[PDB]
Structure formats: structure tokens, C-alpha cells
Amino acid sequence: MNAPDRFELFLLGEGESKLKIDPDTKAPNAVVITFEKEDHTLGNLIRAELLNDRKVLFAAYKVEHPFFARFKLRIQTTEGYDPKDALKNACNSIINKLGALKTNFETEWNLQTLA
Amino acid sequence: MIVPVRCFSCGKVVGDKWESYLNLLQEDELDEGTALSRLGLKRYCCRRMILTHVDLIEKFLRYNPL
Amino acid sequence: LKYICAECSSKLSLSRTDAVRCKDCGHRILLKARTKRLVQFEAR
Amino acid sequence: EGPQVKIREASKDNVDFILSNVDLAMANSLRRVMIAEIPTLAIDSVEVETNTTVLADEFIAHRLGLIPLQSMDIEQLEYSRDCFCEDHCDKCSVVLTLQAFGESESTTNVYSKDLVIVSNLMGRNIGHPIIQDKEGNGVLICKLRKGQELKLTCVAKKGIAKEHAKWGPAAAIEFEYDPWNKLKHTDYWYEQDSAKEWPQSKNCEYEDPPNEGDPFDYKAQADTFYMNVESVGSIPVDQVVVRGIDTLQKKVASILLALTQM
Numbered sequence A: 001m002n003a004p005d006r007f008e009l010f011l012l013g014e015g016e017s018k019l020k021i022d023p024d025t026k027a028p029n030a031v032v033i034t035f036e037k038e039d040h041t042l043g044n045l046i047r048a049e050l051l052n053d054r055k056v057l058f059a060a061y062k063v064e065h066p067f068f069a070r071f072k073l074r075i076q077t078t079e080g081y082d083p084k085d086a087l088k089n090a091c092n093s094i095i096n097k098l099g100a101l102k103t104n105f106e107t108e109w110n111l112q113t114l115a
Numbered sequence B: 001m002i003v004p005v006r007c008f009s010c011g012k013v014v015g016d017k018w019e020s021y022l023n024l025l026q027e028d029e030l031d032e033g034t035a036l037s038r039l040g041l042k043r044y045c046c047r048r049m050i051l052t053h054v055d056l057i058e059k060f061l062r063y064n065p066l
Numbered sequence C: 001l002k003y004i005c006a007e008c009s010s011k012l013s014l015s016r017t018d019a020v021r022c023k024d025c026g027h028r029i030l031l032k033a034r035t036k037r038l039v040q041f042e043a044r
Numbered sequence D: 001e002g003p004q005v006k007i008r009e010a011s012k013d014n015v016d017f018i019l020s021n022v023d024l025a026m027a028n029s030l031r032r033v034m035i036a037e038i039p040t041l042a043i044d045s046v047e048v049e050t051n052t053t054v055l056a057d058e059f060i061a062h063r064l065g066l067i068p069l070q071s072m073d074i075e076q077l078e079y080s081r082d083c084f085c086e087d088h089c090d091k092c093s094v095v096l097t098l099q100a101f102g103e104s105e106s107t108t109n110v111y112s113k114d115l116v117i118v119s120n121l122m123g124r125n126i127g128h129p130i131i132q133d134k135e136g137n138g139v140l141i142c143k144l145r146k147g148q149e150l151k152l153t154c155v156a157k158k159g160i161a162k163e164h165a166k167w168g169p170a171a172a173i174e175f176e177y178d179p180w181n182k183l184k185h186t187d188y189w190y191e192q193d194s195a196k197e198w199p200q201s202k203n204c205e206y207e208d209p210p211n212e213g214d215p216f217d218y219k220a221q222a223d224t225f226y227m228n229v230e231s232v233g234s235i236p237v238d239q240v241v242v243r244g245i246d247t248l249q250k251k252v253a254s255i256l257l258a259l260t261q262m
């Protein structure tokens, strides 16, 4: 028997990376990325904010099969600007925005606690 | 059987509320819909469980094992 | 303690023919004494 | 600064609030992280030393597994998987013990407020089962009469809600945006009137009505969300919101450092 349990649902790659950097061969400056042990709860966020950035040209994620907690992501953008740099810019935007959200939340929570 | 712990849909703990919901119907003579409301279960996914759970455990329990 | 037989908690400790019809009871069906061995579970 | 936040009302167990200057994926991902990823503590493995009751053993296991536990200090200890030890050291786990007896003539209940902490608690606020009502009893486990016995050895571990619904703090969630359907992200099935045949949202009045005749504001975009978080009670609600935000950003920063290390 060899049917997988929920240990492989989110535990990062055992004897394995977290992500692959494979170049597309069908359009200039396109990379596909394979994250694993993740799903929509990260992929939709990265895709949406990366699309909010203006220098990119294409950004879309898909999950292949709900039996597997992996998903792909394809980025192309105009010349000079590296897709990996695009991705790291996107992550920095995300960390900044929601850190601001966090601090704002403790301020208002402490305010709402009367006195 | 006991009341379930933790409503299958939502997850809110149920099971503290059982004997309370009983004595809301024993001496307080209260209508049961209002009884669940005053018990404080305003979503209905939680509400179905207390309303429909049957208590077979005491009918089991009236044997005399050992 | 090896057998139960009944509603009585007659621990018969049976080897052979020590009134299987246990003394406080009158049963003759001899139920068999859940173990003392430690058991494991998994509350997933 | 950025994503402003407004509190409508709060209680011991639920927070209802407004979220603005934010994007849709941001809000939705916050929702999912809160519902699935918050680490906590729950009872996990159980050893029946002695059961006698009519109630079955794996009921006792499963129903034990669902009692919420005090988890303010959850970050202090670490996972059993990552732990340097083996077999539940105090610095990765906690131990629980239950005792019951068919004492009385009438049926005796076994409430959650009977199981007691045994191992080293090391001064961190962990493991005490929550008593929500005002009558001392926890949540009901099992009933006994006059001869039945329970002797339980229990071990709690870290766990997260993704692989089991034991480890959830979430218990419910609420979510709403554009209660007046100005964004036209839906249109109403109806037979005489959309307006008559549908009840108004409770959150209608916090935005103005759609002014009746102005053309379709196509360039607009979703904002101003409506959240209501309602924890089970294993952890305070402010803590669950802030921890969800924290763990989402921890995830994103992890992917960032993995990329840089590649």
C-alpha cells in the first residue's frame, strides 16, 4: 500500500526545494514556477498584486489537480526587467502592505478597548 | 449518543449547551425556538444540531452491565 | 482474574471447574475479561 | 498609511469590522489563512487504560480530540515533528489525564472541567480547557452509572487546521462587499422585481444607495469589505486576527528568502 495522507498536504519538500525556475521556450522572457505545499491562498494573492504592477505583461496561476498541493505560475514581461525581480518586488509590496494593516489593527483594537 | 461536540458545518462548540437547552424546556415552559435564540445560536447550521439530535445514550444506559 | 460470566464481577480466575456457574450468580455463559494490556489510540 | 481598518463592534468572542484600501485577493487570502493556517494546541493521541462505559472507545478518542484548549502561549513550544526529542517531551507537548467513577446512584456526567494537567506546564498559559458557560461544566463527554470506569492518558500536540478540523480556531467567518451591487458582480434571479424579492443587506446603510439613473460606473473597483470573525474560544479574537496576518506574511517572506537563496 502507498496511498498518501495529509502529511504531504503542506510539509515543504522533503529532499526537495520549495520552487523550480524553468524557462519557457514559447515567448521571450517567460518563466514558469512550480510552488508546492501551497495553493490558492497564496497563488491568487501573488498573481493579483503582480498584475497590479505595471511592468509585467502576463501573470496567471493554475493548480493542476486538487489531489496535489502544487501549483504553477507564468510570468512574462518586457525586456531588461527580469521576471525574478518582478516577483521579488511583488513580495516586498505584499509584506509592506499587510504589515501596515497589522499595525493599524492593533491601534484600533486598543482604541476600541475603552480607556 | 451524546450531543456532538463542534457543529459539523461551522465548528462552534456545542455540548455545553445541551442540558441547558433541556432545562430551558423543563421548568421554564419556554418555546423551543426562542429557547435556542436565548441560548444564543443565531446561525442555523449550528441550530439544526441541537434541534434534531436525539439522545440514545440513556436508553443504552438503562441496562445493568457488570 | 480470567472470566466474568455475568452482571456479577466474579473474577473466576479459572483453571478448570471452579463452579463456572458462579457463586453469587447462576449464569453459565462465561464472558472473558478485557485485558490489562495497554492499548493505543489515535484521535485524528 | 495604507489599508485602514474600522471596528464596528466587539465582544469576548467575535469581532466585526470594516476593511478599506485593500484588494480582493488580499481580503480573501486573509480569510482563508484565518480559517486554515493558525497554529494552536489540541489533544491528539490517547491511551485507554481502562474503559467500561457503554460509550465506545473511539468515540471517547474522537470526542476528546475536539475539546478546545487554552492556547495563548502556543508560540513558546514547538512541533513534535521538528522537536529534538522523541516521545512527547515537555518542550514539545503536554499531557492530560482523566478520572471517572460511577459513584452515585443516579447517572454521573463527565465534563471537560475534570481532565487535569499533569506534566510540567513550565509557567506558560497552555492547555486548560475552556469553560464558556457560567456554570462551571465544560463540554459534556460521557455518562456513567454505578460501575463504569474511565482512565485516560492524553497527549496534546501542535497541529494546524489544514490537516484536521481539530486544530481550528476559526469556527465561522463572514464576508461581504458591495452590498448594493454597484459593481454588478451578480444579477438577481427574480420574477417580478429584484428589489422587491430580495431582502436588503444589513450592511446597506453604510454606503449610499445607487442614486437611480446614473450610468454604469465601469471604471470602479471593489473595496470596503465587511468581515465578522467569530472564534471558538481557544484563543482571543484579536489574537486570531493578528496571528493570521502574521502567518500570511511569514509565508510570503519565506517564499522570498527561498527565492533569494536560490
Ligand SMILES: [Zn+2]
Pocket (backbone or CB within 6 Å): B007, B008, B009, B010, B011, B012, B043, B044, B045, B046, B047
Ligand atoms: Zn454550525
Ligand SMILES: [Zn+2]
Pocket (backbone or CB within 6 Å): C004, C005, C006, C007, C008, C010, C022, C024, C025, C026, C027
Ligand atoms: Zn455471574
Ligand SMILES: [Zn+2]
Pocket (backbone or CB within 6 Å): D080, D083, D084, D085, D086, D088, D089, D090, D091, D092, D093
Ligand atoms: Zn519534544
